[PDB]
């Protein structure tokens, strides 16, 4: 009955808010492992201290002075951690490059990949699929949760739709002209990390519903034609299925990874008090609007490199960070970002193979890196 | 996988759509007997021409039932997988019972059999038996396909709330049968669209949604959705709401009970989100509306106590259409005829222990009207 589970990317915010479902459930999750990088060794370090989990792992090759009582350092040091630890659930919180081999590595393993980490499925795609079981990924994302909760609704042959919900963003209604010159500020990142704002730049683009978008299609495995995004200013209700009957079966909570987390855990059962629930004895007010295509084609290009299929998703990725970077620098203005995206893709036919290996992948990254450099420097 | 349907109560609203959704579908389904009460004749015959099913009942030239059980009889005798029981009123509980016996799906319809059957229904049904057919039952059975019932917090109908919501009290002293929508100048029984205005058919569905799905009534809420998109929600216990949503049509939760567990294609038109909206939702105001909170009280009391709420209901609501009592005074009755009710908190045995409960309060209603 108690999962034993690896953290990975166990002190940013996803990983602190699982140990915290864990802390509080200790009947159903046991803590085995946890993995994070060298930067943030302190924070590990108090984990331990916190936890008693010794089995821990510095996921690079960084504070290098400062292990010495460390079971696991150095550059995939985190995919050693996976490999050598029973457990029932891998949780994936990695942030980008680090979080794929430890991602194949958990699959292999048999357990349950409970996972956060976005570039497994957009750049890793096919690779990380052709590794996994039937229901051995559960996705920890709010949109992916509620999607995965949804399709309990019906057999997989009565589904017609995908319907993610999206904020919209801080230019949630902006026409093309108002869009022109809005700065990164402006856009809610503010550049003095090219970390934080990276997130906040792809929610105001709206190439983090692109990213969605792909990951939905290899999560469950419904046409990029029957995924939609509709906006939806309240995340209250963080995604729907429609059925071929006319049904649509939402999920609704008040904002709060908590959950999601939670039934990533546990799956496919659900944890007590993991958040609140919606509360229906105040007035509130549920609202839709289509997206905007034409102001906000990133979601549409990732439905093109989608279909495009292999190495083309993480083209679309890697391409937009090159560009988020150079708008973040003041070297091109903000719809120049989604501009850049579809002219590498344009020229990327060589990468719609599917990978054979990980180095496939990271290969179609730097190419596609390049080709944004390229791109950026010639306006 | 094609079903043998028998359709009770034909001619009405959902008797017509039931039909039109196994026209579309003859793969799924095949009509194999109608059942109506006799004032819709018309209809019953034009039906008996488009089906071509014969074995029909009269709840009369060549028609092989009629008479009062004629339903009943109707059901006992034909080989049906599901019996859908659009019957209103009194006239479908005995078909309820002889469907049960059968040991074919039940699409339940008819208010009345669970009303005020209660147990009596309950245990002439194996579990899985029933699949209910109104709106806000049909959604809450979708949603809690969204966990096991050891996770289910909350059971949350969604309201109307009817052309009187944001009312007060003083507001409902002077409302005439017309402002409440039921027109008492050519009415055929508009008990649904009073229902709706007292907000007793809420307390009718918590009655009915306690019965299905065996949830205790102090986690059975309601809440006002004005569009009426949302049917129903399910909270679990990690805080997780799951809803269903569509374009109001009842083809939708007919296709589902008719073809359990299977979605039948293309049954209703989805939500579409390429256009703007706005789904609200609001508190139930309990002070202006108590019934809800009646229909509880007769709930967990149980035995006869839901039977005698819904037969106070229909003895009050006609004494208000033929303005004999004014408006608050429906569900002030009802309250009336439950406070005093305090014997019939006794499980019914046989029908004959229901339709006692159902005079017993008709008679105390209509001396309270008569007093009103
Ligand atoms: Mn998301
Ligand atoms: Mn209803």
């Given at each position: 009955?108690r999962?034993?589970?690896?953290?990975?990317?166990?002190?940013?915010?996803?990983?602190?808010?699982?140990?915290?479902?864990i802390?509080?459930?200790?009947?159903?999750?046991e803590?085995?492992?946890?993995?994070?990088?060298?930067?943030?060794?302190?924070?590990?370090?108090?984990?331990?201290?916190?936890?008693?989990?010794?089995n821990?792992a510095?996921?690079?090759?960084?504070?290098?002075q400062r292990?010495?009582?460390?079971?696991?350092?150095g550059?995939?040091a985190?995919?050693?951690l996976?490999?050598?630890?029973?457990?029932?659930?891998?949780?994936?919180?990695?942030?980008?490059?680090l979080?794929?081999?430890?991602?194949?590595?958990?699959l292999?393993t048999?357990?349950?990949?409970?996972?956060?980490?976005?570039?497994?499925?957009?750049?890793?795609?096919?690779?990380?699929?052709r590794?996994?079981?039937?229901?051995?990924i559960?996705?920890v994302d709010?949109?992916?949760?509620?999607?995965?909760?949804?399709?309990?609704?019906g057999?997989?042959?009565?589904?017609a739709?995908?319907?993610?919900t999206?904020?919209?963003?801080?230019?949630?209604?902006?026409?093309?002209?108002?869009?022109?010159?809005?700065?990164?500020?402006?856009?809610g990142?503010?550049?003095?990390?090219?970390?934080?704002?990276?997130?906040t730049?792809?929610?105001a683009s709206?190439?983090?519903?692109?990213?969605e978008?792909?990951?939905?299609?290899?999560?469950?495995?419904?046409?990029?034609?029957?995924?939609?995004?509709?906006?939806?200013?309240?995340?209250?209700?963080?995604?729907?299925?429609?059925?071929?009957?006319?049904?649509?079966?939402?999920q609704?909570?008040?904002?709060?990874?908590?959950?999601?987390?939670?039934?990533?855990?546990?799956?496919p059962r659900?944890?007590?008090?993991?958040?609140?629930?919606?509360?229906?004895?105040?007035?509130?007010?549920?609202?839709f609007?289509?997206?905007?295509?034409?102001?906000?084609?990133?979601?549409?290009?990732?439905?093109?490199?989608?279909?495009?299929?292999?190495?083309?998703?993480?083209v679309?990725?890697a391409?937009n960070?090159?560009?988020?970077?150079?708008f973040?620098?003041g070297?091109?203005?903000?719809?120049?970002?989604?501009?850049?995206i579809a002219?590498?893709l344009?020229?990327?036919?060589?990468?719609?193979?599917?990978?054979?290996?990980?180095?496939?992948?990271?290969?179609?990254q730097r190419?596609?890196?390049?080709?944004?450099?390229?791109?950026?420097?010639?306006?």
């Open positions: 009955g999962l034993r589970v690896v953290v990975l990317g166990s002190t940013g915010s996803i990983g602190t808010q699982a140990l915290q479902v802390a509080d459930n200790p009947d159903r999750f803590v085995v492992g946890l993995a994070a990088g060298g930067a943030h060794l302190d924070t590990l370090l108090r984990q331990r201290a916190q936890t008693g989990v010794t821990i510095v996921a690079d090759e960084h504070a290098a292990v010495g009582d460390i079971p696991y350092h550059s995939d985190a995919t050693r996976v490999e050598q630890t029973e457990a029932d659930v891998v949780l994936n919180a990695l942030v980008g490059a979080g794929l081999r430890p991602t194949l590595a958990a292999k048999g357990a349950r990949l409970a996972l956060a980490n976005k570039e497994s499925l957009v750049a890793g795609g096919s690779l990380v699929l590794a996994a079981r039937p229901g051995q559960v996705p709010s949109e992916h949760s509620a999607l995965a909760q949804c399709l309990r609704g057999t997989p042959d009565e589904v739709k995908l319907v993610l999206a904020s919209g963003g801080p230019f949630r209604g902006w026409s093309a002209a108002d869009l022109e010159h809005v700065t990164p500020e402006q856009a990142a503010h550049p003095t990390w090219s970390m934080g704002p990276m997130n730049l792809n929610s709206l190439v983090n519903k692109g990213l978008v792909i990951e939905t299609h290899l999560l469950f495995g419904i046409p990029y034609d029957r995924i939609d995004v509709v906006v939806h200013p309240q995340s209250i209700i963080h995604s729907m299925v429609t059925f071929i009957d006319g049904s649509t079966i939402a609704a909570s008040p904002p709060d990874m908590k959950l999601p987390i939670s039934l990533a855990l546990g799956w659900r944890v007590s008090g993991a958040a609140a629930a919606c509360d229906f004895h105040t007035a509130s007010s549920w609202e609007e289509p997206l905007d295509t034409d102001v906000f084609p990133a979601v549409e290009l990732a439905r093109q490199a989608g279909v495009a299929g292999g190495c083309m998703t993480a679309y990725n391409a960070e090159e560009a988020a970077a150079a973040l620098a070297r091109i203005g903000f719809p120049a970002i989604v501009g850049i002219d590498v344009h020229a990327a036919d060589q990468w719609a193979v599917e990978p054979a290996t990980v180095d496939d992948v990271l290969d179609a190419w596609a890196r390049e080709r944004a450099q390229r791109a950026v420097s010639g306006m």
